[PDB]
């Protein structure tokens, strides 16, 4: 749909859509930018992530409302409408995963880009896993696990423990363990070890980097407080 717009114009309009809180537009613009075939800059990767995180976040919140209504109920309308929202959510996840597979991940050579995209792949398989109930649900869960695990291996080799991407990845992998994999002890261990190793590296950081890292450490702490 965006094939006739300049890459730079798509990026400019994604930023405008973000300011207008028009996240569906933002995602379509960033999808078009990705499909230009060039690698994404750090800022552009963040725009891609913000756009789709907000779109799928609204779908997930709606699915949870409807799933809760459906559970209390057991006509076909509640199930039908939950299925409609669920199908739309799966479509958005498939779109993101398709962008990562064609061809963001294979062209991502630097640790910051490769870990970023593999974290995204884990996240969107995780969102698929949240609604999965059929023959492929175990494979969906393992696909999330595998993507997160590769990202973790690279991040531990190539990034400092305070790196915000590394911290956000560990945060989300810990949520995967707690919420999806039924592994709360793994979730807690990962969050604690991530927090403690970041704490011990804060002394190396500038004031601005310190603020970036401690913000995400607080989310790890919030989860540990919820879980223990």
């Amino acid at each position: 749909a965006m094939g006739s717009m300049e890459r730079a114009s798509l990026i400019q309009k994604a930023k405008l859509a973000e300011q207008a809180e028009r996240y569906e537009d933002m995602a379509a613009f960033m999808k078009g930018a990705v499909e230009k075939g060039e690698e994404l800059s750090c800022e552009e990767r963040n725009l891609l992530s913000v756009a789709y995180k907000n779109v799928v976040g609204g779908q997930r919140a709606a699915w949870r409302v409807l799933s809760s209504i459906e559970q209390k109920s057991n006509g076909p309308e509640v199930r039908e409408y939950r299925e409609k929202v669920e199908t739309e959510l799966q479509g958005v996840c498939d779109t993101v995963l398709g962008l990562l597979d064609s061809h963001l991940i294979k062209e991502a050579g630097d640790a910051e880009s490769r870990v970023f995209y593999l974290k995204m792949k884990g996240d969107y398989y995780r969102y698929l896993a949240e609604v999965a109930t059929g023959d492929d649900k175990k494979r969906i869960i393992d696909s999330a696990r595998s993507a997160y695990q590769e990202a973790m291996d690279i991040s531990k080799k190539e990034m400092p423990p305070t790196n915000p991407i590394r911290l956000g990845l560990a945060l989300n992998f810990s949520v995967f363990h707690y919420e999806i994999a039924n592994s709360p002890e793994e979730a807690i261990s990962l969050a604690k070890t991530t927090f403690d190793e970041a704490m011990a590296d804060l002394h190396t950081l500038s004031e601005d980097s310190y603020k970036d890292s401690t913000l995400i450490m607080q989310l790890l702490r919030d989860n540990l407080t919820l879980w223990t």
């Binding site: 913000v50 996240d123 956000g168 945060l171 989300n172 949520v175 707690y178 919420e179 995400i216 989310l219 919030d222 989860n223 919820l226 879980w227």
Partner: peptide
């Protein structure tokens, strides 16, 4: 209910 990464 737990927090995943957010802005």
């Amino acid at each position: 209910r737990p927090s995943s990464w957010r802005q």
